[PDB]
């Protein structure tokens, strides 16, 4: 985090894809329904768990942008 | 800002379920309280200027050592700001009465209150005394119910300011 390699936070735009919604229905609505598209800001170190978890959830990454560098 | 039906909307959307009775009786509560607040708003619209001026004179009264030269009460533009402040507070009070809720009052004055108060040496007790005096004259200005909910709403404004 504090490290120069820990910095360079990147923003992520996330779309709750159709496959994501189909998986969500079978798993169950334990979270409130929000509009499929939403934005998010993620540091470098926890950048990985974000798209990993989106991959098990079935969603796909719209794009990636860098806050720093 | 919320009217009672506004938090009704918020909840009903939040659980993703239709309105049950309870919020509907709340809607009543609002409607049957609406009219007394309506003539309250009328009366306070009538009395505004005297309210402001008398409040200025009384806040000078109970705190005379701020009217002395060299502090906040001293200053022509200072007193003009006192007057405009009182006007704004009681106008938002009328707004809240019309809404039958504290919503506009909250999101228009209450947010960031304390830090503004000590960030400019504007004593909260000044506005506490001003609002208390306003209770003093509005006790006779309004009668019956309208007096009661006016008392309660400026009381809530004081409690947030206190």
């Amino acid at each position: 985090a504090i490290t120069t390699q820990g910095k360079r936070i990147y923003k992520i735009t996330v779309s709750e894809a159709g496959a994501y919604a189909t998986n969500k229905h079978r798993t169950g609505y334990r979270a409130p329904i929000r509009q499929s598209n939403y934005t998010l800001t993620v540091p470098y170190d926890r950048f990985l768990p974000e798209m990993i978890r989106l991959h098990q959830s079935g969603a796909k990454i719209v794009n990636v942008t860098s806050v720093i560098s | 800002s919320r009217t009672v039906i506004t938090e009704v909307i918020a909840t009903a959307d939040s659980q993703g379920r239709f309105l049950n009775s309870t919020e509907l009786q709340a809607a009543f509560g609002r409607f049957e309280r609406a009219v007394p607040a309506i003539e309250a708003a009328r009366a306070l619209t009538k009395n505004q200027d005297a309210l402001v001026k008398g409040a200025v004179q009384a806040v000078f009264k109970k705190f005379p050592y701020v009217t002395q030269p060299g502090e906040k009460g001293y200053g022509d533009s200072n007193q003009a700001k006192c007057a405009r402040d009182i006007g704004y507070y009681l106008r938002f009070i009328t707004y809240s009465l019309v809404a039958s809720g504290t919503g506009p009052l909250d999101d228009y004055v209450i947010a960031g209150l304390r830090e503004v108060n000590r960030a400019f040496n504007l004593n909260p007790l000044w506005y506490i005394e001003a609002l208390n005096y306003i209770k003093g004259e509005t006790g006779k200005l309004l009668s019956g119910q309208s007096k009661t909910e006016a008392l309660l709403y400026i009381d809530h404004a004081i409690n947030a300011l206190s």
Binding site: R30, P32, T41, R46, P49 | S14, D106, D107, I110, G112
Partner: protein, 206 residues
């Protein structure tokens, strides 16, 4: 009727947690004002800090302001809360690591630990990758993610059957919660001693 009377919620109040089961979860979804904001923060602070009262000076203004704008989810705000030094000073600093993990489970997951194997694994995780990784593991855990969600304030999900929860979780959290009045500061010596270790021990063997 029966000679022995069983009220509707009788189990809720004979067990120390009745209002806990009655108290609903709180979420922060759409733009809002200071009033229910302050209420939500008060509820969060009672939740995370085991009914330890946090001095008004200690709280972080920047994090709550960013949450108010909404750029950071409530999950991120909970991360920032746990990472704050006051969390360690109340919890991590005066208490042993087994007791620390028990408290961490009870607070940020609202449930008792399942088996001593979980405690051992999480102690190993702490030893291998520091303190902050344990909190990141809890709040990144799939169990929390599904049971609460991105926008859910943690609540005591014990005192209630859960999908795939150990039978001893109920007993441990009954022994561990012990009421609204229970505090977990550097005082009372209850937040320091690992009560749950004895119960966790019996689950290792059969």
């Amino acid at each position: 009727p029966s000679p022995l009377e069983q009220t509707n919620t009788y189990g809720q109040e004979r067990v120390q947690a009745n209002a806990v089961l009655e108290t609903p979860q709180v979420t922060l979804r759409a733009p809002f004002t200071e009033e229910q904001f302050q209420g939500a923060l008060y509820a969060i602070y009672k939740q995370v800090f085991g009914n330890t009262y946090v001095m008004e000076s200690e709280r972080p203004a920047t994090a709550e302001s960013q949450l108010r704008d909404g750029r950071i989810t409530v999950r991120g705000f909970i991360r920032l809360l746990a990472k704050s030094d006051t969390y360690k000073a109340r919890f991590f600093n005066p208490a042993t690591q087994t007791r620390f993990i028990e408290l961490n489970h009870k607070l940020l997951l609202g449930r008792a630990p399942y088996d001593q194997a979980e405690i051992s694994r999480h102690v190993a995780l702490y030893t291998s990758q520091g303190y902050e990784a344990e909190i990141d593991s809890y709040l990144d855990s799939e169990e929390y993610q599904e049971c609460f969600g991105e926008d859910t304030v943690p609540f005591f999900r014990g005192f209630t059957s859960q999908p795939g929860q150990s039978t001893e979780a109920f007993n441990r959290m009954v022994t561990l919660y012990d009421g609204y009045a229970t505090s977990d500061s550097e005082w009372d010596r209850g937040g320091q001693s690992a009560r749950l270790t004895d119960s966790l021990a019996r689950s290792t063997m059969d």
